[PDB]
């Protein structure tokens, strides 16, 4: 049977670098902290199909570049969302394509969470197979703080990592969650030393492209029914959100990040 | 304009509801015998949360004991009715219904201030609010298979989800007292600070909630909300579970231990 | 009246079930090899549930593995005979179906000592019980990727709700081996005790439940297991992906690799 | 004695409420332009069920239009406000979402007795009643799409469970007129009688349920309705979906063509 | 695998015959219509599991015997729900597991439905995999003209077989569905003329114990996935049901059935 | 802006592909042997869908096959290399599970032209699509169990749905033919014209449907859509019981017995 060639060039903001033993890095790599362009956040969607069909990956190994995983969509990027409808369709459709092609990816996917992952960023970061946090890495979903619903991922999984206590708490109030408590509450898979995290998830990565892959796999993709079964409940919240960036809070709280003040919403 | 009635809480006899500046609703449960929920009480618990929500003062609820406890749970008339009485019975078991429903299908952010006792009807509105606040030494009972009943007023729609199924099925089916610090550490809570706190700690809570995104967090929780909507079924048969029991023999003895101070003998 | 079959677990030769007063069937796994299951015990395990839950005299039921191990999971022949023959496989693989669902449907309250190593078909019974007692070095392993073949004998129906995914996919996907100790910390298990203490904890857990309230212990349970049994669909998934990986190559060298006592080396 | 607040139904003053000597209330649509939801009916027919249910006095509900049409929708200024202001759009978003809940959280039995038109939010109330009963020439459309929005009013959560998926999406994505004698064929209403009969035959229907065994209609009623209870997050999906297209250009199209008399040329 | 053998001496109140083809034609056969005693109330719930574990059988036709299926519960089954709290869980029990253990049967079942069905015995006819209904078969549910909840089988496949606006009509109001009707909303798969049911029913039979095995079972046992995801509104539904037992009005439906009059609820 | 990468089907060889003006692409199945899946159209039929999803000039997809046949299915090739070779039994297996999640997961509207026989993964195609137009004389035929493999390609998630449980169950076991006309009064289709007005009928819905609301129709689609969605792990299960029962002793005879053009005599 043949199929299409695979080559990487089609997503221009993401630097992917296939390894000896399988594991295909893919970094995030843009000014701020690694924020998530206009471009990067349709990449970061659409990758995955691709990475699923690729005979030479084996594994996937996902980090930011620096002292950070990412800081989350860039301000253009919620300029176009609060400013145009047709805009709104097309990143909407990419926040929800992200989470159901990582979901429908069976390749296995590692990440290395190191420094903040926000929003967008946040989505890769958990919905990774395995995710390595260091100590004081900085995770939070951070909607509500900016004046939106949290419909990005969190309410496809957080209930099914942390219980719904834990869940509720971070996601409304969207109070920083160190990565050493975020292993505690059950948010991510393991927790090392700063110094730590890279090389941590690039040698869990290395073993699962050098395992059985089929056994990896289908293990994976059984386990990934428990959040298709919750799809609807997410495409539920990704409508609220979108829906919530033509309101009035928003307007406010991105004013907020831009003058670097807590939102005074009304 | 859309004309919609006027809201006040005198309808609610059993239940102090102090609206402050900032747009909290504090609910105070205040009944004898640490403030256990009684006939009228058990009614106006389940019924009090849509008038909430379509208050447009109403931007958070802290809900809370007075006193050194949150609540007992139901009181000894409110079983006996159950058991006696099928009008009786088919009253209760609507309002143990509706108040997981009322509370899960409430959008305003409802946070809870556990210290002390926290028992079955009680733990109930604790553990069902968005962000719980439990004291260090917070008593946290299902209490039902102790009593002789089946754990059908809230628990199988929300535990597992919340500690696991084996910590869930652990301390429902052998009902050992779970203390506020442990209970924070399985995920049952959503925080645990020291006693002389906890207040001081949710109302904080609420009001940071009454002063941020209205519809962010309202529409962020509803759409949580929808993992234990689609638990409904599973929680409604539990309700049903839990009040045919009421007509088996066990519980009449499990009430009769808790009259008499000391442990049920059950045949 | 209504006359019922009588009750004699005869029909199970390769478990040994003990009857006490207090109403506990002591269900024991011992078999060469840290009590492998052959191909008859696999039967057995998957069958014998029914009959329990129907058995007046049981009112709880303590499993544990007979020495210093629970169960080794199933033996090299009966994975021969899954690789090897279609009718046998579709056996096996029926057992292996049967004995998840068995259990759930089990209304008699379970509950498992884990002294030792739980593998497999065994770490299924240890972590489908409804409480579980772990000793602190007691080793919970899956064992199916490191095998070679997928995780289908339990862990998809159930671990996401026990640990959370992020610590399910981990453990599954690497078989890194899990202690009882972490295991109760990240709620795979509902206690974890001393190693020589797991027997006698156990013991008295399962004997306070068969002298408690019948009717509420089990329907609490049964509504609890409402969670599982809506994932029944996810986990024949997983079992027909395992069967399916069982007629690979992967499998062939994970197998070799085991009797040689080596790391396999997947290509 | 429990106090319960009493109801009167002036809270709902779009809507005619008659209750009989049998216990049945039935509720009128009475408004200009074949009895067009505006925006304080779009309100009205949400927040009523909630109320009828905790009536003593109401046993059963019989929903119909005034006149030979149950109901042509949305007004033009309902769906003005809807694409012209925020606030307007949430409130009436959220209206709709709490008709279909409402409606299907309402254990009280409701019949209704569609003649003529039933459109949009009309065509909400008259499939969702229970019983419904059609006359042969009565025009059910949904419309969204030939208006240019989603058709997120109620469809989602049921028309599958009705029809079946493939009537489903044919009717829902074309439009196509849908008349009450096909209607009936195909699985989407409970009857279909002459013209004349509509009102007669839905009365006597719900004069019956009225005279029956209220528990036992009622909680054969609400089982039932866990089925479109468990498609909730699929129904909240398509609100959503829905109240996002207002803000596309396609509508704004759709409308201009339905004020013009002619057909929408969509770009 | 030593398994137990299997001998339906213990099911005492069921006619059960093995054929050369491997059909097992079991026979409800019971005075007043073939209406369910205490004993065929157990049986009928509990046979289900051993013809499933019967290497013989490769399919189930169930009838009743003369002219009628089955009339449903006897008044001394009725009158033990209602007296006992013991006999009630008893008789719970078998109804809760009467739908399950025929659900979780992969043996493929054939049902011959010629006269009335009520009850326990429309719940047997109803929940085979293909029923052959007479075009003058009185199908009744009959739980709310009795004065108690649909909770015996309707509310986990109904909506499945007709659509919600035809099961609420039927289940509420117990109208009586003839069996040509049935068939045209989908409630059964075949209609025949009345003096044709058995042999169709039969032949149909026949085809499937000579068919492709494991092909024709499985294929039934994940369509059965529809109805075991159901299971949890089932069994609410049951509990209703038993809840309503204690309750006034069926005292006069159980009096109402007694007098062959209509119930006058209060 | 931002980037994306340009469409042209050159990567399907084995379907042709055409695009209109009215933006409706038109999939044309076309091979020896009434349409006959080989190894290369089960791929392309799987993957096509993704990328029509994202292709700007297409509004609507229209779905047919050449000739007086819609398509017979897998070949005997693609059969033979399923029951030969694991690897080769994986790549089908993969394609039949993508086939029918890539179709529900696209939100473009599809319309199939049903003349003549559609079997097996040419019948996914015919019912899969959102509007299916089947003629009075066409014969639909799922296969399988006449085939002696299971029914795992598309009826697991549907025919339920389509056509409620009883007859879903009568056609699928037997494998009776089922005709167009047959098909349109039970729901399993959209529509049923003569055979000769069955392109006609399905090129102007598929054409009114490119020039619609695409928001409003591809968004009313994706909600409806969402109820195959939440049947997933049911459709799974039955992918890998077909693909574990093809490696039984029954698919040999029915194989044979098709390829004798004579009944199979199983054992």
Same mark, same amino acid.
């Given at each position: ?36 362009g ?38 253009d990027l ?31 996917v590692?990440?290395?969470?190191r ?8 989505? #890769?970061? !958990?919905?990774? +197979?395995?995710s390595?946090?260091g100590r *004081? $890495?900085?995770? =939070?979903? /951070?909607?509500?703080?900016? &004046?939106?619903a ?14 719904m206590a ?5 996601l ?15 948010? #991510?898979? !393991?927790?090392? +030393? ?5 090389? *941590? $998830?690039?040698? =869990?990565? /290395?073993?699962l492209?050098? &395992? ?34 033509s ?6 709280? !991105?004013?907020a990040?831009?003058?670097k003040?807590?939102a005074?919403?009304?």
């Amino acid at each position: 049977v043949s199929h299409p060639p695979v080559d990487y060039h089609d997503f221009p903001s993401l630097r992917c670098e296939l390894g000896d033993d399988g594991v295909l890095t893919v970094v995030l790599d843009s000014p701020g902290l690694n924020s998530v362009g206009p471009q990067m956040h349709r990449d970061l969607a659409d990758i995955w199909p691709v990475i699923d069909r690729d005979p030479a990956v084996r594994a996937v190994l996902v980090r930011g570049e620096g002292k950070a995983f990412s800081s989350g969509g860039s301000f253009d990027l919620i300029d176009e969302t609060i400013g145009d409808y047709q805009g709104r369709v097309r990143i909407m459709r990419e926040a929800r394509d992200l989470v159901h092609n990582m979901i429908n990816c069976d390749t296995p996917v590692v990440s290395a969470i190191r420094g903040p992952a926000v929003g967008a960023g946040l989505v #890769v970061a !958990l919905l990774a +197979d395995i995710s390595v946090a260091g100590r *004081t $890495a900085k995770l =939070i979903d /951070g909607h509500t703080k900016l &004046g939106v619903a949290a419909g990005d991922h969190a309410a496809i999984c957080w209930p099914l990592l942390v219980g719904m206590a834990k869940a509720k708490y971070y996601l409304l109030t969207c109070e920083t969650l160190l990565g050493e408590e975020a292993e505690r509450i059950g948010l #991510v898979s !393991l927790c090392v +030393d700063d110094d730590d995290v890279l090389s *941590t $998830a690039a040698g =869990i990565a /290395g073993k699962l492209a050098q &395992g059985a892959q089929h056994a990896i796999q289908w293990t994976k993709r059984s386990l990934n029914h428990w959040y298709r079964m919750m799809g609807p409940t997410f495409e539920t919240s990704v409508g609220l959100e979108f829906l919530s960036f033509s309101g009035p809070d928003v307007q406010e709280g !991105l004013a907020a990040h831009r003058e670097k003040r807590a939102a005074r919403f009304t």
